[PDB]
């Protein structure tokens, strides 16, 4: 009686908390620029090394002539994802521009090249550091002496994946090369994962990352992020370390084992698993992979797992998940309270997101995925 | 079981909050300054006109010359005021000092003066704007425009009052002059309220003032309490509009009827009516003043005093008040969440102070005197 009324002044305020969240990190100006007259010269570049190489293009921190103050990153391409990319709605996860022209870009700014040629460059308001490719590659050692903390940003990252390939399905947008060097990682005012290169995606050696439904006669995106899995873990392509698995038909036991360094190493390996799977019709949807990080972030432990297969009614079953809830969501309200009286990270929006929207139901979808 | 669990968890969240309200509103520097050669001439005077003339004593801003910078006011005393005060721990509505000395001071500054002469000249960091005579004199016309408005700012008052009364029974001691202009008016980083004037305080005409039990042959400040409510209501003293009742053993219904124009006014009768009750045993505690106060600014409403008298049993009134409690605890968390996306005010902290110590038994009592 009561306890439905407090359970949805928690749910309704969390999910408020998370839209006021989701503008507090999306505001800025995102208007277009006008280039004409040898726009090229109005970008003074801060620096002549890159600040970032992805899969597509070089970058280059820039002062724009006519806002010099501003952030701004010149993005120098290497050869249609501009046409897809701008037919979408802006997403936290998913790479904005304001402009590109055409430029003659000298040979010593590509590292490709090296007589003067004529290329597309593009202007972002979020500058690329690095890209998780860089960061996987830098991330060895620590790995090693820090696993839970390496595993966790791995999740987190993973998270912001999944959020920002949710948002391409209701467009029937695939991006099909989901690859570490075309994931970016920015600053919030480096840990914001920004999804980019566009050049392959599909509106409704290379064959290692493409599905099996592909190479035996639309979840080719939830397949390579399985694949993605493995290589943040610093394990190579399994379709690479065991290549006889596209020439079959493989199960569970046959893709290669995650090792077990971390509390969030066995979520993972059944995640990629899932997302591995060779049937598509059996491959989880990417919204099912994101209630897994959710859960290995901040959701149920295996703790609660043990009481949940004890029980033998739905109703047991979904008090438990449900005391869970209210208990989570009652902690992470007490957490925004505190916070007024002394900033909000990147994860505490991500976990307001979470708890706003996860239902007993939800929860019981993860959770006998994960059993 | 689990309710018992997150009703633990808001409890001991909002006694947090409450504690980081009051740190707030007290932090400052509080060490008591260092007088000696002509330390008058180091007051420079901001202003020649009163900034505020008290009971006791007239106050000017002043710059401090070894400090010019921060907010600093001269009180000229009039006339053991230091000895009491000074023995009791800070209490953010009681007046505190940062020095005093004596002083030759011109007899322009003195209303009540006017050949020089010594008086006690006292420094306090919080600049009283106004005393509540002032404030009650001047909001006439608003009490009659606006009721509910300046009748809720009255029990705003009243609580702050009660918190400052309440400070001093563990030292054992009673102000005994509480008149409306001993009561000062401050700002926070006027609605703070500051006693001041403990001339006539008690370590363990002039009697309209005086309980009934001192004449005929310690719940002194509860009496006089009483006799305020009436005056910041712009009603005289009872016992001078009806001058008859100290000669006697006055009842409820002697006492002169407060105007019904607010829905503040019934509990404010009823409450000077406990604290006017001629038998101090049967006067009530300025504890359960400050609870009738708190209950009338956001504690249960007339509504559910209703479904409290027709529950049969105390388990069902239990209920029914620790709903309440529930809920209010919850939306009143919601608040301080929301505040950590977009200040802190005096109200705030109060009502946090009231939902974090209030229990059912508590409420029970209060509901019980208030029917």
Known sequence: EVVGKIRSLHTDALKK?????????????????????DSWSDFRLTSDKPCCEAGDAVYYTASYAKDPLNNY?????????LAVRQSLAVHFNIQQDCGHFLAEVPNRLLPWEDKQR????????EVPCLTVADFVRDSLAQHGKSPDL????????????????????????????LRLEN??????????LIVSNFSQA????????????????????????????????????????????KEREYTRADLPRIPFRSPYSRGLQQ????????????????????????????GPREDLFQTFTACPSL??????????????????????????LDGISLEDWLCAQYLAFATTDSLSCIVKILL
Chains 1, 2 share one sequence.
């Not at 004529?118 to 308001?125: A, D, G, L």
């Not at 390496?150 to 090369?177: A, F, I, N, W």
């Not at 902690?331 to 309270?337: D, G, Q, V």
């Open 17 to 37: 908390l998370a839209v006021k969240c989701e503008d507090l990190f999306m505001a800025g100006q995102k208007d277009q620029l006008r280039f004409g007259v």
């Open 73 to 81: 990153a010149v993005k120098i391409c290497k050869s249609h994802s």
């Open 118 to 125: 004529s290329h597309v460059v593009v202007i972002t308001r």
């Open 150 to 177: 390496y595993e966790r940003q791995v999740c987190l990252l993973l998270l912001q994946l999944c959020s920002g390939l949710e948002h391409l399905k209701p467009y029937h947008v695939t991006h099909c090369d």
């Open 183 to 192: 994931l970016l990682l920015v600053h919030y005012q480096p840990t914001r």
């Open 202 to 245: 599909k509106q409704k050696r290379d064959q290692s990352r493409l599905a099996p439904e592909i190479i035996t006669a639309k979840k080719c995106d939830e397949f390579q992020t399985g694949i993605l899995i493995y290589e943040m873990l610093h394990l190579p392509n399994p379709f690479d370390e065991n290549p006889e698995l």
């Open 271 to 298: 995640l990629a698993s899932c997302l591995l799977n060779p049937n598509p019709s059996e491959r989880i949807l990417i919204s099912d992979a994101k209630g897994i990080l959710q859960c290995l972030l901040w």
């Open 315 to 340: 109703v047991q079953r979904n008090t438990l998940l449900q005391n869970w809830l209210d208990i989570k969501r009652t902690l992470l309200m007490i957490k925004f309270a505190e916070k007024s």
